[PDB]
């Protein structure tokens, strides 16, 4: 052949979001989170027009419960923690 390439459409796609030590609490990094990552909905893909970039039209805030596992203490601490996940619902190629 080879088979012609199909452009990656500007649309919502299942992505993996890493639950980072920085965003929720900034006290230090030496605390582990469970689960370490979760699935999210994001805008990914390309635009046919040059000038344009793929962008979210509207987002949805989704809170989830995780656990903070503090290691650098006299004893282990397994604390509940809420993390706000940003999900994209619609994507469109926008003028810039």
């Amino acid at each position: 052949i080879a088979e012609p390439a199909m452009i990656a459409e500007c649309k919502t796609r299942t992505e993996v979001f890493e639950i980072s030590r920085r965003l929720i609490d900034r006290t230090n990094a030496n605390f582990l989170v469970w689960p370490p990552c979760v699935e999210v909905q994001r805008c990914s893909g390309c635009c046919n027009n040059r000038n344009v970039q793929c962008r979210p039209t509207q987002v949805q805030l989704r809170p989830v419960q995780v656990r903070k596992i503090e290691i650098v203490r006299k004893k282990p601490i397994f604390k509940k923690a809420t993390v706000t996940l940003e999900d994209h619902l619609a994507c469109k190629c926008e003028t810039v």
Partner: antibody, heavy 120, light 106 residues
Framework: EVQLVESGGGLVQPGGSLRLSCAASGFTFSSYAMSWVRQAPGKGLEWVSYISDDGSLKYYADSVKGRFTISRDNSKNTLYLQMNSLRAEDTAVYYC?????????????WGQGTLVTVSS | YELTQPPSVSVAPGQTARISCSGDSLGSYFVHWYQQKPGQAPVLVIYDDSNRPSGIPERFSGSNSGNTATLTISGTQAEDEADYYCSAFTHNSDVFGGGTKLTVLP
């Protein structure tokens, strides 16, 4: 059949030392975090020490800090507790217990316990 | 500090036993419950506030919110007579509560 068996308990003098052992069987001992929990006669449960699945992280209660040492031999499927500078208040039944998850503090499996009496 | 439990709870057979456990911001931590019969090792009856391990009867249920965790035993039988210990790994030095002895009337 999943099991934990403590040994090494006995009568000991104050300021003396004792090493406790805990033999694990029926499961992969290396994949689990472990704790020592003690119970004075007629009294309640007191967490003593915690050890990571690999032995990297070791935690102690303030009542045993500087005197007790936790360790493990994953090749032998054995948990250890080295108790030095023993005091009458250290008299208890010593339990060996398994944390089913690295991210959890609950205790899945317990041994039958080993009695340590500290007296002059 | 300390995880506070009533030293004893008395109930009539078939009634609902409620054993409390109090600690500073306890609701923001995971609470486990252990059942201990004389001469026996503790048994995990509830983990992570409300979860029952396999082999634990439906009678046992738990909750944790705010400052207090509660163990609930509906349809209390003679075989439920034991010492109950709450447990949590928090910022305070005590991993276990003082215990509650559950007794069945008369």
């Amino acid at each position: 059949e999943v099991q934990l068996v403590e040994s090494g308990g006995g009568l000991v003098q104050p300021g003396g030392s004792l090493r406790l052992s805990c033999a694990a069987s029926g499961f992969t001992f290396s994949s689990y975090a472990m704790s020592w929990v003690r119970q004075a006669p007629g009294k309640g449960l007191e967490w003593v020490s915690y050890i990571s699945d690999d032995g990297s992280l070791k935690y102690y209660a303030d009542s045993v800090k500087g005197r007790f040492t936790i360790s493990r031999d994953n090749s032998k499927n054995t948990l250890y507790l080295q108790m030095n500078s023993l005091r009458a208040e250290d008299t208890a039944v010593y339990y060996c217990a398994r944390h089913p998850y690295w991210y959890g503090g609950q205790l899945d499996l317990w041994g039958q316990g080993t009695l340590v009496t500290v007296s002059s | 500090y300390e995880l506070t439990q009533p030293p004893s709870v008395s109930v009539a057979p078939g009634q609902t036993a409620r054993i409390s456990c109090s600690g500073d911001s306890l609701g923001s931590y995971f609470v486990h419950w252990y059942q201990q019969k004389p001469g026996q090792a503790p048994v995990l009856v509830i983990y992570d506030d409300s979860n029952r391990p396999s082999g634990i009867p439906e009678r046992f249920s738990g909750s944790n919110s705010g400052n207090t965790a509660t163990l609930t035993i509906s349809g209390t039988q003679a075989e439920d007579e034991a010492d109950y210990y709450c447990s949590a790994f928090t910022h305070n030095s005590d991993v276990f509560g003082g215990g509650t002895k559950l007794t069945v009337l008369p």
